[PDB]
Amino acid sequence: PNVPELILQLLQLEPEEDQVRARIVGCLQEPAKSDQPAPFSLLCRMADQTFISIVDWARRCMVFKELEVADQMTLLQNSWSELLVLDHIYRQVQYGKEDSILLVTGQEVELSTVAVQAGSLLHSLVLRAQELVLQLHALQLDRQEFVCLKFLILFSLDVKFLNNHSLVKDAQEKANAALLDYTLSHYPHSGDKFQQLLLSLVEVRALSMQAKEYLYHKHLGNEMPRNNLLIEMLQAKQ
């Protein structure tokens, strides 16, 4: 089978997993201060750091690097939560264990731990994400479809919410063509994998919206000098 040029470009832009982990862990293992209660503070910084890696990834991305910062900010403003969710989901697909979840740090959490420690919103969101994990495993989601889905999500904003329409609209069209062409060539006996994958993105967006609600309900404070990128993303307006 042949692999769409856009996908091959995306595979060259994928960070090395252990380097991403080592960097995140190094930040997390710093002598900490005293304001929210464990384990939340640590996990929150972890998510923050994961998004930082994601931003770094987007800065190396073909069409993204071109755009004016105003637009870059707007794309990331629209997609940050979905990128994080997709990152988490894909981590679980590779991990392949129904009983626990794997975090970006290599740390592993029992679903039975979540059942007792987690509020109802958080608990129902984690379990809902495991369902999507099972679906995508059964669909044989691979690394090529993954990086392409990340790219699609990144550029998922209706271009009317942007200043420049041209470059982003084309990018959307190229990525959609690449995913279709790849699923047809590499998974001919699946039939509508292309559609089924785009349908997955609908559930990613739904999980992403519940994730923001959980965070909103934390009633987080603004920062003196801002320290947490995700906090900024969460409080950012339209």
């Binding site: 931003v55 900010m73 403003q77 801002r226 947490n228 990128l229």
Partner: peptide, 10 residues
Amino acid sequence: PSLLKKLLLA
């Protein structure tokens, strides 16, 4: 006060 914008320009 834009951490995001700061990162994108670095």
